[PDB]
């Protein structure tokens, strides 16, 4: 894409040790699957394209970008060592939205619907085995 958007977050790095855990499997097969198909998922399914959206200040404000397209790749390509890393990526995505946008805004209400679902699912994150 555009040189004016940053490169996306890292999804592949052989130097980073990787592991499958039952918790990570749940994050893919339950959590991500649920949020991805939500009616309000589409703004969060790829990095924010600040050029196309005419938001030239977006990456001036948001210095830790994250999105569900990145998280999906990270889960499908086994990037993580543990569930906390992946939960932190979800939380970063929500908090970016809430920091950049006004509390009324449609994108915020969309993020909040996904976050409510997320919380319900994370409360049932299985014990690590
Ligand atoms: O099971 C599937 O086919 C599937 C498809 C998309 C996503 Br996101 C999660 C899934 O688990
Ligand atoms: O600025 C944002 O947070 C944002 C993200 C994705 C889309 Br699509 C529109 C937006 O306004």
Cα dihedral value 37, 74, 81, 87, nearest 10: -40
Does ligand 1 lie within 6 Å of residue 52's CB atom? no
Stated in angstroms to one decimal place, the resolution of this structure is 1.1
Does ligand 1 lie within 6 Å of residue 72's CB atom? yes
Handedness of CA 80, 86, 92, 93 (dihedral sign): positive
Which DSSP state fits 44? G
Does ligand 2 lie within 6 Å of residue 40's CB atom? no
Topology classification of domain 22-124:
Histone Acetyltransferase; Chain A (1.20.920)
Does ligand 2 lie within 6 Å of residue 43's CB atom? yes
Ligand 2 centroid – CA 50 distance (Å): 8
Contact 54/48 with Cβ under 8 angstroms? no
Question: Closest Cα to atom 1, ligand 1: which residue?
Answer: 29
Q: Comparing C-alpha atoms, which of 79, 80, 86 is closest to residue 30?
A: 86
Domain edges within the chain:
22-124
Judged on CB neighbours under 10 Å (0-12, 13-18, 19+), 16 is: exposed
Side-chain-side CA neighbours of 101 within 13 Å: the count stands at 17
* φ, ψ (nearest 5 deg) of residue 34: -65, -50
Among 33, 37, 114, say which to mutate for ligand 1: greatest number of ligand atoms within 8 Å of CB: 33
């Amino acid at each position: 894409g555009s040189h004016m958007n940053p490169p996306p977050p890292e999804t592949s790095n052989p130097n980073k040790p990787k592991r499958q855990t039952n918790q990570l499997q749940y994050l893919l097969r339950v959590v991500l699957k649920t949020l991805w198909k939500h009616q309000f998922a589409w703004p969060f399914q790829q990095p924010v394209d600040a050029v196309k959206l005419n938001l030239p200040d977006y990456y001036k404000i948001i210095k830790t970008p994250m999105d569900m397209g990145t998280i999906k790749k990270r889960l499908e390509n086994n990037y993580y060592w543990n569930a906390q890393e992946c939960i932190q990526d979800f939380n970063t995505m929500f908090t970016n939205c809430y920091i950049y946008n006004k509390p009324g805004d449609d994108i915020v209400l969309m993020a909040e619907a996904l976050e409510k679902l997320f919380l319900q699912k994370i409360n049932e994150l299985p014990t690590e085995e």
